[PDB]
């Protein structure tokens, strides 16, 4: 499996700061075996895609579930392709838990994006009250089942596990805890989809990753990379891209 | 009150179709006394603003309530200004009822955009069951209270009434709500703000009905949906002349 590092800029960006990030990425020494993605705010997707070499993927942070229609404020996968972007992040914990997106909606968006020819980073993960009730697998598997319900092919999917129970609380997840979830998710893929897909699919870690912990997380056998948050805006991003080499 | 016509493109747009719409706007003769706005999808805001003469406003169809933060998929008023756009539509019925935005969130976004120097079309309106229950005013006034609560200045606000309940809305029904909202502004904000604020109609607006709607004394323009993608938009922009 090819190591995969995606930088989610979240709601951060400006012509000035984007240019500084692009110059940092363009000039950095990055492991040639790392697949690298950045996800700017939607206003900046076309310009960031023009300025950054195709060695870098550029992703939207969200999209909707049909090509066009009466959905004020939404953008479709067809529009993403029209501006040269071939990736989207769907189901991020902030969209599920702050902006109230349901499992079913995330699954419908994922299936439509794939149908349009857009690759998807599909995000899953459980909150603290769910983890403390023993529901880590139940929650992760329910979110994946909603994606599988509408998907017939997985070659253009990357799964991101977000330990929301740690992100939202200030707790720190150990590399052993991340590995344990990644393994359970991979076994679900083996069981519900196929051993070949489970063997191929990248499962990336979306808890807090900085230059300080990326190398120990990267060595875990079922962690295939990272969905990076705030470190995506900083020189730490380069060390994270290099975490596996 | 200066007549105001906004075209909400919703989730419609592409480089090719945007170019046809931009050429349509550019070749049009529009009443010089009418304020005209278009709202493309967020991906296309910088290019549309670059390509359209500054006689036209270019608006986002949504934004968030702080300048930056951990809100994957959201954009801020600061970003809008950074790409040259100084307008946003907030509280549209599709965002309230499909995408689950609360009254409080719409009010927070509206106050923040205004504080950031972005002008706001703030949308209100009642659903069919609410209208049939006699709750048009109750709903509209509850929505305006959340918008009004933390606003101190109204010169950069336009109110859009969307009869989500429509069925067909008559010019008498639109006038009745616009008048009620204006009288609410008189008592809750001030008579001076009420006399000057634009209240635009955002129900189904076509070339066939825009002139009858425009003559109503408390209808100050339109927030147009599907007709904003068609040459019919120009006739609607010219409805007051």
Author numbering:
A (entry chain B): 5 to 249
B (entry chain A): 5 to 170, 175 to 249
What does the publication say?
Triosephosphate isomerase (TIM, EC 5.3.1.1) is a key enzyme in glycolysis and catalyzes the reversible isomerization between dihydroxyacetone phosphate (DHAP) and glyceraldehyde 3-phosphate (GAP). The overall structure of OvTIM is similar to that of other known TIMs in that it contains 12 α-helices, three 310-helices, and eight parallel β-sheets, forming a classical α/β barrel fold. In OvTIM, a specific SAD motif (S157–D159) is located between α7 and β6, inducing the formation of a subsequent 310-helix γ2 (D159–I164), although the corresponding region is not conserved in either vertebrate TIMs.
We constructed four variants, including a SAD deletion variant (ΔSAD), variant in which the SAD region was substituted with AAA (AAA), variant in which N115 was replaced with Ala (N115A), and double variant (N115A_ΔSAD). The α7 of N115A_ΔSAD variant moves to the original position of the wild-type and exhibits a stable conformation because all other steric hindrance caused by N115 does not exist. The overall shape of the designated region of the N115A_ΔSAD variant is similar to that of HsTIM but showed a unique difference with an α7 shift that resulted from the bulky side chains (M148, R152, and M196). The overall stability of OvTIM was also affected by the SAD motif and N115 in a complementary manner in that the Tm decrease in the ΔSAD variant was rescued by N115A substitution.
